[PDB]
Amino acid sequence: EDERRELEKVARKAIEAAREGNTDEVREQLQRALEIARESGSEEAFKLALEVVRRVAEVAARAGNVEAVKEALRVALEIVKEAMELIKDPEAIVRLALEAVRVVAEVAARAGAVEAVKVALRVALEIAKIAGTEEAVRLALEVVKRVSDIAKKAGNEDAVKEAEEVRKKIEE
Amino acid sequence: EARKELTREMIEVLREIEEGFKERF
């Protein structure tokens, strides 16, 4: 697929600008990756754009670039809405929604927002309720898995405690 | 306030994703 090798080029350019502090270049490449996924229409392209959003949000947070992180969260919302308009498959919308909810939850665990980590787990449980599929709860447990993992390596004890609770809630 | 803006946008983007999903279903 030639659509994939386009997002990799804009990913190298977006993560490079996230380190040197070129927040304006981050806005351009993130908006470009949105246009790449918007033109094709396939779920894989809408998905592959989320990796770029998650990739730049990691390096921007690791470099103290707070505004570049806020730009990634904005794009993560835009790919979801652009998918709800393009994608006709309701199950593909569920996957892309939890994949975006998972991204905003990993950045909140590093940032130790606690309240945002709680809302992310609260939203992720709600998305899997209307879906009612075994695929939805599998990805919902993955948002809890990533929140608990990232919060441990960060030493934020408030999130690993909330993650273990939400995991036990849907086990029944 | 810069970190408060980061957390505030996280809550908003999350509730917008949930809102758009409850409308399609």
Numbering used by the authors:
A (entry chain A): 2 to 173
B (entry chain B): 179 to 203
Lines from the paper:
We set out to design proteins that can switch between two well-defined and fully structured conformations. The hinge amplifies small local structural and chemical changes to achieve large global changes while the chemical environment for most residues remains similar throughout the conformational change, avoiding the need for global unfolding. Designing one of the resulting conformations to bind to a target effector couples the conformational equilibrium with target binding.
Using a combination of Rosetta two-state design (see methods section for details) and proteinMPNN(27) with linked residue identities, a single amino acid sequence is generated that is compatible with the state X hinge as well as with the state Y hinge-peptide complex. We solved crystal structures for two designs, cs207 and cs074. For design cs207, crystals were obtained from two separate crystallization screens: one screen for the hinge alone, and one screen for the hinge in complex with the target peptide. In the absence of peptide the experimental structure agrees well with the state X design model, and the structure of the hinge-peptide complex agrees well with the state Y design model. The crystal structures of hinge cs207 in both designed states demonstrate the accuracy with which two very different conformational states of the same protein can now be designed.
